[PDB]
Amino acid sequence: SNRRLQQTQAQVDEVVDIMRVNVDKVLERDQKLSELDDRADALQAGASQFETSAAKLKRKYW
Amino acid sequence: SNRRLQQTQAQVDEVVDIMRVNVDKVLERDQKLSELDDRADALQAGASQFETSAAKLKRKYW
Amino acid sequence: KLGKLQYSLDYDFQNNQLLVGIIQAAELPALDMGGTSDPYVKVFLLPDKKKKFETKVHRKTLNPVFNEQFTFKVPYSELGGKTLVMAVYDFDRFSKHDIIGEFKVPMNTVDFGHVTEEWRDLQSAEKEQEKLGDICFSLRYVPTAGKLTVVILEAKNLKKMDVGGLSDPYVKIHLMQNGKRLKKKKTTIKKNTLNPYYNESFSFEVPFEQIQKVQVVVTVLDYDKIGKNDAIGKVFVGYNSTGAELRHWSDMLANPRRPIAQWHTLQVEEEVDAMLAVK
Amino acid sequence: ELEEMQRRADQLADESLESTRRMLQLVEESKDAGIRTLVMLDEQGEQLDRVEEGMNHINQDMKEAEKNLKDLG
Amino acid sequence: ELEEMQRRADQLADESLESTRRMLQLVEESKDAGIRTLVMLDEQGEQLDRVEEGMNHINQDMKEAEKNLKDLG
Amino acid sequence: MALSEIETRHSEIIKLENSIRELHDMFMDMAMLVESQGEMIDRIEYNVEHAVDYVERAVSDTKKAVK
Amino acid sequence: MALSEIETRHSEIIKLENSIRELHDMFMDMAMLVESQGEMIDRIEYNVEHAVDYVERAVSDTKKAVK
Amino acid sequence: MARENEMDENLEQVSGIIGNLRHMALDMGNEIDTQNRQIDRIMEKADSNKTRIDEANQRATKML
Amino acid sequence: MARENEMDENLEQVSGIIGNLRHMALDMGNEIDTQNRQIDRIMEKADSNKTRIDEANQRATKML
Ligand SMILES: [Mg+2]
Ligand SMILES: [Mg+2]
């Protein structure tokens, strides 16, 4: 019964076509996550600086 | 309804997979036909030669 | 301890048939009144239990001599993946004939070409768990919001429930406390499958102050339209749980804001419900 | 020629068989890899949610800080 | 942004539509090409049959010629 | 839906059109090859019929020669 | 059937095995990437929580400073 | 929705035509195979007669 | 035929597992998309707060 063989083959091909797209989307996710990582590091750096300045200002105007 | 789109797509893919194999088999047919052509030319050549010899032999033993 | 068994084995390539000879047995334990049992040996091909051969019943001897022969019309190609079973039975006129011993011989260890004949020690026949099915799911609990996320992933090697085919499994989840069934959930019904895949998430409202007093009951059942729907297996995690279940629970607790997936072995509903009626 | 042919056929049969067994093993590995992938997706998802709540909190706090600095100036 | 977005959507709709029309045309050409292909296959098939009958006739004739040459020798 | 759904729809549709086009080209090549091979068969049958004639005449001649 | 049928059967089966294998490798790569990205998210959330702490303390200080 | 439905009809027709194309491709390929077997037969017979006529011609010219 | 059937069973199991793999791939991809949208949101908010905190820090150090 070649019908089942070829049908299963078509299933496999379909799932492959799904998975490669999924993989590319995952790569895009890796890019976005990397940039978010850099942005977060910069964010916490600025946060610490602003915290220090806030300490100075509290020790000034109170 | 993506189901019909993807289903039709699967149909197209299947028919493609049929047709490429058919095409290769056709190429094989082209090979076989070419060789048969050469063989036929040689065959009719030998046929004419044998016809001539047969004419001589008839004009000899009768 | 029952005794030993002398038997003969060889293959006739001229007729393509297996020649199994039962010679005798020795030092068999006595189970009958007179101080001696009434033994008889049942021999059959190990692969398929069809057309089993039985010897004549010998009266009151712990060293019976049968010297009988049996023929198994089996090709030589199929023979290699076929085993032989020789079990010694005790005859009793007014009750079930108790099995004295048994012996299994793999046909891939057997060497044909020379006529084989040996003594082998008898062993006690096997009476393991019947279900042999497993269910895998993930547990996630974050203490702050009190959310319990039970994601039914997938079951495998489930017991057949339908006649001459696979089963129609579906997962029912109960949440119990002090013997009472609070919440009721279920999944989609996957039809005709040996290994059902669901990947379905469920959420429950469980406070942090009662986390050590809750029961999570996962049940895999079979679905027929007509009549009562039977049950394949069930396992429970949480309060009064033991084994890998309590382990998975403790992993859920030790790892908050994170889901831990694990497999679990299906138990009979009687024992489980008996455990849930505790305290 | 004939014996070698029959043996060839049975050979191809066995080869295809063990091939299918290899397929079963491969789709099993694929299956499990997929499952653990989904698990990772759930975990990282909840982590992303916590990140979002973090961002919201930061926004509100800095809004208040902006208010105080505008009240000081 | 919004107007351009709606217009973009309708645009994609039209594009997909005319695309499907192109598909219909293409599968029509394919259809006809296939038909005439089959016709050619029938014709060439009958020609091959005539070729086979030719070969058979040649074989029998040369068998007779072989007989005469063996009767002459 | 949204623009994502429409975009993916459009993409898969274009994919379908390209697959269809490949199918088409395959059919065209098919018809072509079959035709050329048809001409080849023409000349084959020609040579064969000529051969048949020659063989027939030869056989007649030898058959009259032996007796 | 014949040897041709068995051979084509075997061929298509091997083709299936290779497609299956590619699918497998795709799943493996999937799990891998998702894991590494998971670690990336770990350090992101770390930096974010630190940032939150710093911002909170800063806001407290300014809030006490203005009044 | 008219835009969408119109397209839907198109896709349905394309589906039917594709099915017919499948059937045609099957018949095509099958007959191609059978004709290939026949061609093999033809070349076998043609080589046979080639040998026949070569040997016969040699034997015929031998008696000259 | 036992050789052939055994193989048949194998192919059926492979078929089922492949179907499940399809479903899993769909869920996977979808959730990946949604999480990507969420990440986009996160980077928008994070850039917003980055600007907020830079401007706020400058204004704060201005009064020093
Ligand atoms: Mg007794
Ligand atoms: Mg049922």
Short mmCIF file of N, CA, C and O in Angstrom, two decimals, chain D:
data_model
loop_
_atom_site.label_atom_id
_atom_site.label_comp_id
_atom_site.label_asym_id
_atom_site.label_seq_id
_atom_site.Cartn_x
_atom_site.Cartn_y
_atom_site.Cartn_z
N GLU D 1 21.73 -16.66 -10.08
CA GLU D 1 20.99 -15.44 -10.41
C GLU D 1 19.67 -15.38 -9.65
O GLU D 1 19.31 -14.35 -9.10
N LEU D 2 18.95 -16.50 -9.64
CA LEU D 2 17.64 -16.57 -9.01
C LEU D 2 17.74 -16.55 -7.49
O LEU D 2 17.06 -15.77 -6.82
N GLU D 3 18.59 -17.42 -6.94
CA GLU D 3 18.82 -17.48 -5.50
C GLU D 3 19.26 -16.12 -4.96
O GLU D 3 18.74 -15.63 -3.96
N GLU D 4 20.22 -15.52 -5.66
CA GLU D 4 20.73 -14.20 -5.30
C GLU D 4 19.62 -13.15 -5.38
O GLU D 4 19.64 -12.16 -4.65
N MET D 5 18.66 -13.38 -6.26
CA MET D 5 17.54 -12.46 -6.44
C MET D 5 16.55 -12.53 -5.28
O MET D 5 16.14 -11.50 -4.74
N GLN D 6 16.17 -13.75 -4.91
CA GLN D 6 15.29 -13.96 -3.76
C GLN D 6 15.94 -13.41 -2.49
O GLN D 6 15.31 -12.67 -1.71
N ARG D 7 17.21 -13.77 -2.29
CA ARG D 7 17.97 -13.28 -1.15
C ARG D 7 18.06 -11.75 -1.16
O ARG D 7 18.05 -11.11 -0.11
N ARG D 8 18.15 -11.18 -2.36
CA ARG D 8 18.18 -9.73 -2.52
C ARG D 8 16.86 -9.11 -2.05
O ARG D 8 16.86 -8.10 -1.35
N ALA D 9 15.75 -9.72 -2.46
CA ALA D 9 14.43 -9.24 -2.07
C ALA D 9 14.24 -9.27 -0.56
O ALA D 9 13.85 -8.27 0.05
N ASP D 10 14.53 -10.43 0.04
CA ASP D 10 14.43 -10.56 1.50
C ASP D 10 15.35 -9.56 2.20
O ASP D 10 14.99 -8.98 3.24
N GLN D 11 16.53 -9.35 1.62
CA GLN D 11 17.48 -8.36 2.11
C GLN D 11 16.85 -6.97 2.17
O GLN D 11 16.88 -6.31 3.21
N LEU D 12 16.27 -6.54 1.05
CA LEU D 12 15.62 -5.24 0.98
C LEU D 12 14.49 -5.14 2.00
O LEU D 12 14.27 -4.08 2.60
N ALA D 13 13.78 -6.25 2.20
CA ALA D 13 12.71 -6.30 3.20
C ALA D 13 13.25 -6.01 4.60
O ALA D 13 12.72 -5.15 5.32
N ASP D 14 14.30 -6.73 4.98
CA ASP D 14 14.92 -6.53 6.29
C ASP D 14 15.44 -5.10 6.47
O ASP D 14 15.20 -4.47 7.50
N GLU D 15 16.13 -4.60 5.44
CA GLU D 15 16.67 -3.25 5.46
C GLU D 15 15.58 -2.21 5.69
O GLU D 15 15.72 -1.32 6.53
N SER D 16 14.49 -2.32 4.94
CA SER D 16 13.36 -1.42 5.10
C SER D 16 12.77 -1.53 6.51
O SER D 16 12.41 -0.52 7.12
N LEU D 17 12.69 -2.75 7.03
CA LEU D 17 12.17 -2.98 8.38
C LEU D 17 12.98 -2.22 9.44
O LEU D 17 12.45 -1.37 10.17
N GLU D 18 14.28 -2.53 9.51
CA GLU D 18 15.15 -1.88 10.49
C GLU D 18 15.18 -0.37 10.27
O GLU D 18 15.34 0.40 11.22
N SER D 19 15.00 0.05 9.02
CA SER D 19 14.90 1.47 8.71
C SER D 19 13.70 2.08 9.42
O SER D 19 13.82 3.13 10.06
N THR D 20 12.55 1.42 9.33
CA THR D 20 11.35 1.89 10.00
C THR D 20 11.54 1.93 11.51
O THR D 20 11.04 2.83 12.20
N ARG D 21 12.27 0.94 12.04
CA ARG D 21 12.59 0.95 13.46
C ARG D 21 13.40 2.20 13.83
O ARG D 21 13.11 2.89 14.83
N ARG D 22 14.39 2.51 13.00
CA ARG D 22 15.18 3.73 13.16
C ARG D 22 14.29 4.97 13.15
O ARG D 22 14.50 5.90 13.93
N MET D 23 13.30 4.96 12.27
CA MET D 23 12.33 6.05 12.20
C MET D 23 11.59 6.21 13.52
O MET D 23 11.46 7.32 14.03
N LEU D 24 11.12 5.09 14.07
CA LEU D 24 10.40 5.11 15.34
C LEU D 24 11.26 5.72 16.44
O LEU D 24 10.80 6.59 17.20
N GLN D 25 12.51 5.28 16.52
CA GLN D 25 13.44 5.84 17.50
C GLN D 25 13.61 7.36 17.31
O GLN D 25 13.55 8.13 18.28
N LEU D 26 13.80 7.78 16.06
CA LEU D 26 14.03 9.18 15.74
C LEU D 26 12.84 10.07 16.10
O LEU D 26 13.01 11.16 16.64
N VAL D 27 11.63 9.60 15.80
CA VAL D 27 10.44 10.39 16.09
C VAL D 27 10.15 10.36 17.59
O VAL D 27 9.47 11.24 18.11
N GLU D 28 10.68 9.36 18.29
CA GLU D 28 10.60 9.35 19.75
C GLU D 28 11.50 10.43 20.36
O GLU D 28 11.05 11.22 21.21
N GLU D 29 12.75 10.47 19.92
CA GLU D 29 13.67 11.52 20.36
C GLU D 29 13.11 12.90 20.04
O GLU D 29 13.16 13.81 20.88
N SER D 30 12.57 13.04 18.83
CA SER D 30 11.93 14.28 18.41
C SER D 30 10.79 14.65 19.35
O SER D 30 10.68 15.80 19.78
N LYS D 31 9.96 13.66 19.66
CA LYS D 31 8.84 13.83 20.58
C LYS D 31 9.29 14.42 21.91
O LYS D 31 8.80 15.48 22.33
N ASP D 32 10.24 13.75 22.56
CA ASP D 32 10.73 14.20 23.86
C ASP D 32 11.37 15.59 23.80
O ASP D 32 11.11 16.45 24.67
N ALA D 33 12.20 15.82 22.79
CA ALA D 33 12.83 17.12 22.58
C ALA D 33 11.78 18.22 22.48
O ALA D 33 11.92 19.30 23.07
N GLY D 34 10.71 17.93 21.75
CA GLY D 34 9.59 18.84 21.63
C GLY D 34 8.93 19.13 22.96
O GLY D 34 8.64 20.29 23.28
N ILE D 35 8.68 18.08 23.74
CA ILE D 35 8.06 18.24 25.05
C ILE D 35 8.88 19.17 25.94
O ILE D 35 8.35 20.16 26.48
N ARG D 36 10.16 18.87 26.10
CA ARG D 36 11.00 19.68 26.97
C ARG D 36 11.13 21.10 26.42
O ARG D 36 11.26 22.06 27.18
N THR D 37 11.06 21.24 25.09
CA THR D 37 11.05 22.55 24.46
C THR D 37 9.85 23.36 24.94
O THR D 37 9.99 24.52 25.34
N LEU D 38 8.67 22.74 24.89
CA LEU D 38 7.45 23.39 25.36
C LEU D 38 7.56 23.78 26.83
O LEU D 38 7.13 24.88 27.23
N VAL D 39 8.12 22.89 27.64
CA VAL D 39 8.32 23.18 29.06
C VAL D 39 9.16 24.45 29.23
O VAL D 39 8.78 25.37 29.98
N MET D 40 10.28 24.48 28.53
CA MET D 40 11.15 25.65 28.53
C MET D 40 10.38 26.91 28.13
O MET D 40 10.57 27.97 28.72
N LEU D 41 9.51 26.77 27.14
CA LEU D 41 8.71 27.90 26.67
C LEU D 41 7.78 28.42 27.75
O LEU D 41 7.60 29.63 27.89
N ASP D 42 7.18 27.52 28.53
CA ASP D 42 6.33 27.94 29.63
C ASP D 42 7.13 28.69 30.69
O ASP D 42 6.75 29.80 31.11
N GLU D 43 8.24 28.08 31.11
CA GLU D 43 9.10 28.70 32.13
C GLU D 43 9.54 30.10 31.72
O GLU D 43 9.30 31.08 32.43
N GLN D 44 10.19 30.18 30.56
CA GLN D 44 10.67 31.45 30.03
C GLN D 44 9.53 32.44 29.82
O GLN D 44 9.73 33.65 29.93
N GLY D 45 8.34 31.92 29.51
CA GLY D 45 7.16 32.76 29.36
C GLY D 45 6.80 33.47 30.66
O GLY D 45 6.61 34.69 30.69
N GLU D 46 6.69 32.69 31.73
CA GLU D 46 6.41 33.26 33.05
C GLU D 46 7.50 34.25 33.46
O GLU D 46 7.22 35.30 34.06
N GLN D 47 8.75 33.92 33.12
CA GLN D 47 9.86 34.83 33.38
C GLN D 47 9.66 36.16 32.65
O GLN D 47 9.89 37.23 33.22
N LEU D 48 9.22 36.09 31.40
CA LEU D 48 8.94 37.29 30.61
C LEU D 48 7.82 38.11 31.23
O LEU D 48 7.87 39.34 31.23
N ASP D 49 6.82 37.43 31.78
CA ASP D 49 5.73 38.11 32.48
C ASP D 49 6.26 38.88 33.68
O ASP D 49 5.91 40.06 33.89
N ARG D 50 7.10 38.23 34.48
CA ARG D 50 7.72 38.89 35.63
C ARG D 50 8.54 40.09 35.18
O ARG D 50 8.55 41.13 35.85
N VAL D 51 9.21 39.96 34.03
CA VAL D 51 9.97 41.07 33.46
C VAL D 51 9.04 42.24 33.13
O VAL D 51 9.37 43.40 33.39
N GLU D 52 7.87 41.93 32.57
CA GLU D 52 6.90 42.96 32.21
C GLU D 52 6.39 43.70 33.44
O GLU D 52 6.32 44.93 33.46
N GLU D 53 6.05 42.94 34.49
CA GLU D 53 5.62 43.55 35.74
C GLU D 53 6.72 44.45 36.30
O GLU D 53 6.45 45.54 36.82
N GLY D 54 7.96 43.98 36.18
CA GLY D 54 9.11 44.78 36.57
C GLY D 54 9.15 46.11 35.84
O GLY D 54 9.31 47.17 36.46
N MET D 55 8.97 46.06 34.52
CA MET D 55 8.98 47.27 33.70
C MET D 55 7.86 48.23 34.11
O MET D 55 8.09 49.44 34.20
N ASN D 56 6.67 47.70 34.34
CA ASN D 56 5.54 48.52 34.77
C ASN D 56 5.84 49.24 36.09
O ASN D 56 5.63 50.45 36.22
N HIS D 57 6.35 48.47 37.05
CA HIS D 57 6.73 49.03 38.35
C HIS D 57 7.76 50.15 38.19
O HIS D 57 7.63 51.21 38.80
N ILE D 58 8.77 49.90 37.36
CA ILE D 58 9.79 50.90 37.07
C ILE D 58 9.15 52.17 36.52
O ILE D 58 9.49 53.28 36.94
N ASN D 59 8.23 52.00 35.58
CA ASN D 59 7.56 53.13 34.94
C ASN D 59 6.81 53.98 35.97
O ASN D 59 6.94 55.20 35.97
N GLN D 60 6.03 53.33 36.82
CA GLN D 60 5.25 54.06 37.82
C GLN D 60 6.15 54.77 38.83
O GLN D 60 5.93 55.94 39.18
N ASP D 61 7.19 54.07 39.28
CA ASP D 61 8.15 54.65 40.22
C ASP D 61 8.83 55.89 39.64
O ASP D 61 8.95 56.91 40.30
N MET D 62 9.26 55.79 38.38
CA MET D 62 9.93 56.91 37.73
C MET D 62 8.96 58.04 37.43
O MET D 62 9.36 59.20 37.32
N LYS D 63 7.68 57.70 37.30
CA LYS D 63 6.65 58.72 37.13
C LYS D 63 6.55 59.53 38.43
O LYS D 63 6.51 60.76 38.40
N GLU D 64 6.53 58.82 39.56
CA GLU D 64 6.51 59.48 40.86
C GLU D 64 7.76 60.33 41.09
O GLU D 64 7.68 61.45 41.59
N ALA D 65 8.92 59.78 40.75
CA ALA D 65 10.18 60.50 40.89
C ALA D 65 10.17 61.77 40.06
O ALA D 65 10.65 62.82 40.50
N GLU D 66 9.62 61.67 38.85
CA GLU D 66 9.44 62.82 37.98
C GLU D 66 8.56 63.87 38.66
O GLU D 66 8.85 65.07 38.61
N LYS D 67 7.50 63.40 39.31
CA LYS D 67 6.61 64.29 40.04
C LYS D 67 7.34 65.03 41.16
O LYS D 67 7.19 66.24 41.31
N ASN D 68 8.15 64.30 41.94
CA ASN D 68 8.88 64.91 43.04
C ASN D 68 9.92 65.92 42.55
O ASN D 68 10.09 66.98 43.15
N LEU D 69 10.60 65.59 41.46
CA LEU D 69 11.59 66.50 40.89
C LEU D 69 10.93 67.75 40.31
O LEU D 69 11.52 68.83 40.33
N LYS D 70 9.72 67.60 39.79
CA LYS D 70 8.97 68.75 39.28
C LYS D 70 8.40 69.59 40.43
O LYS D 70 8.17 70.79 40.27
N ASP D 71 8.19 68.95 41.57
CA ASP D 71 7.70 69.65 42.76
C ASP D 71 8.84 70.34 43.50
O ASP D 71 8.62 71.25 44.30
N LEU D 72 10.06 69.89 43.24
CA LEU D 72 11.24 70.46 43.88
C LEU D 72 11.78 71.65 43.09
O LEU D 72 12.24 72.63 43.67
N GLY D 73 11.71 71.56 41.76
CA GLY D 73 12.19 72.62 40.90
C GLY D 73 11.36 73.88 40.95
O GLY D 73 11.85 74.94 41.34
#
